[PDB]
Amino acid sequence: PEKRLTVGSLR
Amino acid sequence: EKRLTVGSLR
Amino acid sequence: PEKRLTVGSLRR
Amino acid sequence: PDFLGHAENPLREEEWARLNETVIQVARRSLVGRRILDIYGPLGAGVQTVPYDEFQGVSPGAVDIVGEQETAMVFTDARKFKTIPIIYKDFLLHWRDIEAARTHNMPLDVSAAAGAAALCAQQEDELIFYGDARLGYEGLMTANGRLTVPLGDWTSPGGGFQAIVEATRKLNEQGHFGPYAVVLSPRLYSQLHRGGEIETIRQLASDGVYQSNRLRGESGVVVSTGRENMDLAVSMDMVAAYLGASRMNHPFRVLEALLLRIKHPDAICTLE
Amino acid sequence: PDFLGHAENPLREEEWARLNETVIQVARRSLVGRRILDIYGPLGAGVQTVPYDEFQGVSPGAVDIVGEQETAMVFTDARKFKTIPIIYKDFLLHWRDIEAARTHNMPLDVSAAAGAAALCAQQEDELIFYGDARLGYEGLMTANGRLTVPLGDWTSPGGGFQAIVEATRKLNEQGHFGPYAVVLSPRLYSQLHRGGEIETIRQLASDGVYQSNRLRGESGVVVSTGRENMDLAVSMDMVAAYLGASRMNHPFRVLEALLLRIKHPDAICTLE
Amino acid sequence: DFLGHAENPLREEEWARLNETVIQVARRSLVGRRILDIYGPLGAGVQTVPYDEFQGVSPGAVDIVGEQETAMVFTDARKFKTIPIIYKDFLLHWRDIEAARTHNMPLDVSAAAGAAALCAQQEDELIFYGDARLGYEGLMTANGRLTVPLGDWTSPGGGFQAIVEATRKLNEQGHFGPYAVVLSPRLYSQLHRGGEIETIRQLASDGVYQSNRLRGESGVVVSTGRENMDLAVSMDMVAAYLGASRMNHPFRVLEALLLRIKHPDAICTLE
């Protein structure tokens, strides 16, 4: 049950 | 077995 | 027992 | 995660149970055609045709010591089969809605299923009362050999009796009697509550007086309740099925395979 | 003792096998409709209805590297679910004959069985080629859309070949191409026998030229034998059954349940 | 195999390769998230996010005793907004999948990468321009964009003076944070002729970027910050399986983003 952001946080 | 989900009301 | 076809199809 | 695939069932056990509960309860509290028809039984989805009887030709029995007298046997006048129709209604659920129901722990939405079940039940009642014309199905309202009776004055002190008692005596003059079941349009069933005449009509009958919104403005029927007089073939009962995730939006469909067969048309009377 | 009472099975295994082989050989030696019609698989005595399918119209299909051209699917235009009739014939066997067969250890005399099988074959041919108009059945001569073609060119050196061509042209225009079958009345059959024309007919048909007495005086059909055009739903083929007993004799019945379904009616052309 | 409807036609290694391909293609294509601060992922379940409209300047006061009210009162009709779905569909041939299964052909995901690029372009277009039918707002479509004249790009100092005027307007409206400039390709090119790119990059302190979603001659400068603008994400780029239309296997690159311009005064459209 983890969102696991992948593409974001480019900045 | 197969059954009757909405039985006879009368 | 097992249902069968007594007289076959007259093809060929 | 789950929607990142094409699965056979987009719902868990509890969600499926709730989905079935909603449709079943809507059917229970919406069906009135089932309240004037007995049922043949759960034949199965494989069965698609049932024999149509039409017991319109009958002959009296014999009275003899040795039992050698000739009586025409009671049997189907013309052996016919009628295919069982299917009543279906589709509703769509959003994969994000299922995801929200799962993760947020909020209850899953089944109100679309309730609406589909209500529409299917209304369509069943319409089919039972007014038979389909394109498919050649007869109904209680429209059937050959129906014993039409005039109601005329309904707004008098005993208007209900000027039609009900005449219908009862006509059905009895035809050999059909016993526990009667009476159905009225909402207008008549409401206006007949003026002075307690509903109790008198219920005393006249034995299975009760119901109201169906599918009937027209001023119409009603009285029927004999025997399974021999009328029957309701049930190939498969009201249920919910899954149609496969088209564009990840899950479609479901309420299904019901029923057929009204009138063995003896004289057991029905329309207070036209 | 076996004759001195009523019994469920008078004959033994040998007599049952003799009856079955006799009726089978007589059917094989007598049937002509089954020689140009494919038969659908056996269902059994339980099944009484089959889906009467219609496939009017042709959708050419598609060829593509990836496999996406969206051609119309082939499906039944309208389901009908016709019922399967029963073709039967009754014969009688003598109890003394059965006892004589048992005592002498000789084959049973089944001449009446052979006659009943021949008459049942005749009735099957009549049902296949012509309708009855009482049970709502369609035959090769009664189906709607037979593509009737003039035939009045007889007693000529070329007549007959010319007709079996016009039907072919109509079939090709409607979309039928397979090896044809030509079933003809005895009169014009001999009229084709005149000039050796039957040799030409048999090799353009490439599937058979046959003679049937059930046709009228001057009639004939050119049909496309390929499946998806005509079919014979078979509940059960010719069998021998015990119809009780009366006056100590044993009545038996040859039984067979067939139904001709013409799925695509344009595959038949009647040379009326 | 291909003779039946497939739960999943791709193995775990092919799934991993597909995910890496779509991730890298998205990373190389979006200019937005480089300036927009990204809100925490919420999962596919969440469909709506609160939308703020803090119009009005109010700077924390200075005093010996904290008895002065300096707070952003919640506006009436909070006007929650739903998160749209950004997606693009691509196809994989069943014959190609079977030639990968047997004979060990390496599976090709060029169509998937193209779909990911188209999806990123579409979401960038959504960010920079709202949807009229969906009733959404963008950087160049907002109300109160503080439009400023942008003439004289041909002169070396014209772009610099226009950006300085935009920064002056932002300062007058109460925004003094880091600045970022996003220009159309034409404007970006002319600002490379003259070496001025360096000066602007230093003036911005966050970034000067180039996007094709802009018009022929347009540009934007934004005071980057969480309170000024935000990008709420429910799920990032991911490949989902869309059943089996015909026999070819369809997949879809999927994501869920929503732009929240809480301060419309943080944006100055150079146009």
Side-chain angles (χ1 to χ4, degrees), chain A, chain B, chain C, chain D, chain E residues 1-7 9-227 229-272, chain F residues 1-64 66-271:
Chain A
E2 293 83 3
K3 272 69 183 176
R4 185 150 310 211
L5 183 138
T6 63
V7 186
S9 48
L10 269 188
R11 197 152 91 156
Chain B
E1 293 83 3
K2 52 154 169 43
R3 304 151 201 211
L4 183 63
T5 72
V6 179
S8 200
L9 309 173
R10 105 171 260 280
Chain C
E2 288 309 271
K3 65 179 73 174
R4 292 183 291 113
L5 197 73
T6 48
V7 64
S9 176
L10 307 177
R11 291 310 262 183
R12 278 73 172 176
Chain D
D2 58 355
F3 47 87
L4 270 17
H6 193 163
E8 304 336 300
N9 170 7
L11 298 186
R12 294 151 31 61
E13 191 146 280
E14 201 285 300
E15 296 154 0
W16 260 120
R18 184 176 177 87
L19 192 43
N20 282 290
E21 280 173 350
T22 304
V23 60
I24 297 184
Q25 301 293 339
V26 165
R28 299 291 179 90
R29 313 182 321 250
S30 186
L31 285 177
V32 71
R34 205 156 291 199
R35 296 180 204 271
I36 51 173
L37 271 294
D38 210 12
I39 68 181
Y40 180 28
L43 307 185
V47 176
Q48 311 165 234
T49 61
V50 296
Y52 206 65
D53 291 297
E54 290 272 77
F55 284 116
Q56 204 154 10
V58 297
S59 83
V63 293
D64 170 40
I65 300 92
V66 296
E68 302 271 292
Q69 295 179 359
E70 296 294 328
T71 55
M73 291 177 121
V74 55
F75 193 55
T76 296
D77 291 331
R79 187 68 159 181
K80 294 192 321 322
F81 277 72
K82 305 289 290 300
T83 175
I84 299 183
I86 191 166
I87 323 298
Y88 50 91
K89 184 62 177 182
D90 300 333
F91 61 96
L92 190 68
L93 303 183
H94 201 283
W95 57 277
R96 283 204 291 180
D97 297 350
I98 297 89
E99 285 302 282
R102 291 182 180 178
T103 289
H104 293 196
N105 215 336
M106 41 186 307
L108 178 56
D109 214 1
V110 289
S111 63
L119 272 295
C120 182
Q122 296 294 321
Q123 183 62 255
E124 171 192 325
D125 291 331
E126 162 67 25
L127 174 69
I128 285 183
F129 283 105
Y130 275 120
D132 195 1
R134 54 174 297 262
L135 300 185
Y137 290 128
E138 296 278 26
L140 309 180
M141 281 325 307
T142 59
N144 273 357
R146 208 166 62 257
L147 308 177
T148 47
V149 161
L151 170 36
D153 193 336
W154 25 63
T155 22
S156 92
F161 281 62
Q162 272 74 96
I164 300 300
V165 72
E166 302 296 330
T168 288
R169 71 155 270 272
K170 303 244 307 213
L171 258 48
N172 241 292
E173 278 171 31
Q174 302 277 332
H176 296 295
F177 32 57
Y180 289 116
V182 180
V183 161
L184 276 80
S185 65
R187 180 198 295 268
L188 266 65
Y189 184 80
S190 315
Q191 71 177 353
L192 201 63
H193 271 91
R194 218 55 74 77
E197 186 177 355
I198 296 313
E199 186 52 281
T200 57
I201 299 290
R202 187 165 296 104
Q203 291 292 339
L204 192 151
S206 298
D207 272 18
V209 180
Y210 308 90
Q211 54 164 321
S212 178
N213 296 115
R214 300 321 300 247
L215 269 67
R216 302 307 158 86
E218 293 214 280
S219 297
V221 287
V222 60
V223 297
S224 297
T225 50
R227 68 180 65 252
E228 71 266 20
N229 302 290
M230 301 165 318
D231 213 338
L232 205 56
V234 187
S235 179
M236 65 179 288
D237 194 359
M238 191 95 78
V239 77
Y242 176 56
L243 264 57
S246 184
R247 309 189 273 225
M248 321 165 78
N249 295 351
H250 315 270
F252 296 83
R253 157 178 286 186
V254 286
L255 293 159
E256 176 150 46
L258 291 183
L259 180 64
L260 167 60
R261 46 176 186 177
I262 302 169
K263 284 151 218 185
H264 214 295
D266 307 338
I268 306 166
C269 182
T270 55
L271 320 153
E272 286 185 5
Chain E
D2 292 331
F3 61 94
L4 283 185
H6 218 238
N9 74 341
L11 321 168
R12 280 202 219 112
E13 301 276 60
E14 311 87 300
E15 279 107 339
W16 276 120
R18 271 271 300 174
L19 271 179
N20 285 16
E21 66 183 1
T22 293
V23 62
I24 280 178
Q25 293 179 356
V26 174
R28 280 174 177 169
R29 194 270 171 211
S30 184
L31 297 179
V32 71
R34 202 164 293 190
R35 274 201 291 263
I36 80 167
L37 282 72
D38 291 330
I39 62 170
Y40 178 73
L43 311 177
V47 188
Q48 315 183 19
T49 44
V50 295
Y52 181 76
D53 297 333
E54 290 288 328
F55 296 99
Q56 273 293 50
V58 296
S59 61
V63 62
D64 197 1
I65 311 182
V66 294
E68 280 152 344
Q69 276 213 353
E70 188 44 48
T71 60
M73 297 211 308
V74 289
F75 188 70
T76 65
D77 304 342
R79 278 287 180 84
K80 299 294 183 182
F81 263 102
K82 274 176 168 180
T83 175
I84 309 167
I86 289 182
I87 300 99
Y88 64 107
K89 186 58 183 180
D90 303 331
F91 62 97
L92 194 61
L93 304 184
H94 206 283
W95 61 284
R96 286 209 288 175
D97 297 1
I98 300 168
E99 295 302 323
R102 293 201 178 96
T103 54
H104 292 100
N105 214 57
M106 48 175 267
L108 191 78
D109 189 17
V110 289
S111 297
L119 273 298
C120 175
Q122 197 82 85
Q123 273 308 291
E124 164 191 329
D125 275 7
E126 175 68 28
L127 170 68
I128 287 181
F129 285 107
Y130 270 95
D132 48 354
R134 183 180 63 83
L135 303 177
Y137 288 141
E138 298 294 329
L140 295 177
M141 311 315 258
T142 62
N144 304 137
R146 272 184 321 283
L147 294 174
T148 307
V149 63
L151 167 75
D153 59 356
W154 277 130
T155 72
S156 74
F161 171 73
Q162 283 333 304
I164 275 109
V165 164
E166 276 173 285
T168 292
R169 283 209 296 99
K170 312 272 301 203
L171 293 184
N172 264 317
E173 290 166 0
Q174 301 294 336
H176 296 283
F177 63 91
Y180 299 144
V182 193
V183 172
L184 305 168
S185 71
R187 282 278 326 291
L188 66 92
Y189 190 56
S190 80
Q191 303 333 319
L192 294 174
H193 271 251
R194 203 51 41 181
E197 270 167 342
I198 57 174
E199 195 38 69
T200 302
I201 306 299
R202 283 183 148 77
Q203 60 188 356
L204 186 142
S206 161
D207 212 358
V209 184
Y210 299 91
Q211 173 214 20
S212 169
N213 56 344
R214 298 276 73 184
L215 290 180
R216 294 331 181 201
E218 282 216 290
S219 281
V221 296
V222 185
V223 306
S224 86
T225 61
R227 214 170 318 162
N229 297 320
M230 324 166 289
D231 195 11
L232 286 175
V234 186
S235 278
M236 63 165 209
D237 266 333
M238 293 180 183
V239 292
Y242 182 76
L243 301 203
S246 67
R247 288 166 251 179
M248 311 205 58
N249 275 356
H250 307 262
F252 292 84
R253 162 176 293 185
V254 288
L255 282 158
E256 155 194 30
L258 295 193
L259 182 52
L260 166 56
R261 37 188 203 171
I262 304 168
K263 288 161 285 187
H264 186 273
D266 288 333
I268 303 144
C269 186
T270 63
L271 307 148
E272 295 156 18
Chain F
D1 51 4
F2 60 94
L3 296 163
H5 209 82
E7 171 76 90
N8 47 16
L10 263 58
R11 284 141 91 201
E12 311 295 29
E13 276 66 69
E14 290 145 89
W15 272 116
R17 287 177 65 239
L18 188 59
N19 287 339
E20 306 165 349
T21 301
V22 60
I23 280 171
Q24 305 280 18
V25 168
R27 289 240 185 83
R28 308 183 33 233
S29 324
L30 2 104
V31 338
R33 297 180 190 174
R34 281 160 179 180
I35 54 168
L36 270 297
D37 277 286
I38 179 164
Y39 182 76
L42 318 170
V46 182
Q47 290 164 347
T48 51
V49 74
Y51 184 78
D52 283 328
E53 225 96 61
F54 294 134
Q55 53 269 334
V57 35
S58 146
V62 176
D63 204 18
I64 294 93
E67 296 297 322
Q68 186 172 356
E69 71 276 60
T70 49
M72 311 285 78
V73 294
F74 273 132
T75 177
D76 298 330
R78 265 192 102 187
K79 84 202 301 303
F80 289 69
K81 301 198 74 64
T82 177
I83 307 177
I85 295 183
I86 302 299
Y87 55 88
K88 188 76 213 204
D89 311 346
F90 58 95
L91 199 57
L92 266 71
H93 208 283
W94 62 279
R95 282 199 288 189
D96 293 351
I97 281 164
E98 181 85 29
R101 210 59 40 91
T102 102
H103 119 243
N104 303 47
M105 189 87 102
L107 188 62
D108 188 19
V109 292
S110 58
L118 266 295
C119 174
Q121 182 197 90
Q122 180 54 48
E123 62 86 20
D124 263 5
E125 206 276 336
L126 159 75
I127 284 180
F128 282 95
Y129 284 98
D131 202 0
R133 184 191 50 121
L134 264 295
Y136 278 63
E137 290 285 358
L139 275 76
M140 321 275 308
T141 76
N143 302 81
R145 282 174 287 100
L146 306 176
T147 313
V148 67
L150 73 163
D152 291 331
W153 293 97
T154 70
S155 68
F160 191 77
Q161 68 194 88
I163 299 187
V164 168
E165 287 284 82
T167 57
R168 184 191 60 81
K169 296 286 294 301
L170 264 293
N171 278 7
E172 289 157 279
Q173 296 286 344
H175 294 136
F176 317 90
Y179 293 10
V181 184
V182 172
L183 294 174
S184 58
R186 166 73 52 82
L187 265 69
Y188 200 93
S189 80
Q190 309 163 279
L191 181 127
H192 241 329
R193 277 84 78 68
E196 314 96 312
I197 169 62
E198 319 302 331
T199 89
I200 320 294
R201 293 225 232 253
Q202 286 314 310
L203 186 139
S205 71
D206 193 327
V208 191
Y209 303 120
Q210 186 180 181
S211 178
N212 53 326
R213 309 320 302 158
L214 276 297
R215 294 301 141 101
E217 265 168 40
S218 299
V220 69
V221 63
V222 285
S223 191
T224 73
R226 304 191 140 271
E227 73 271 11
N228 279 253
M229 291 135 298
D230 218 348
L231 204 54
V233 299
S234 175
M235 71 185 328
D236 274 340
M237 281 275 188
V238 75
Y241 183 18
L242 263 58
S245 181
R246 275 74 166 183
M247 321 205 77
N248 300 294
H249 293 277
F251 294 83
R252 169 177 290 185
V253 289
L254 206 55
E255 77 179 349
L257 282 72
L258 171 46
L259 180 64
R260 298 189 296 178
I261 43 172
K262 306 167 193 172
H263 277 91
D265 293 330
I267 303 174
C268 185
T269 69
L270 286 202
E271 41 94 354

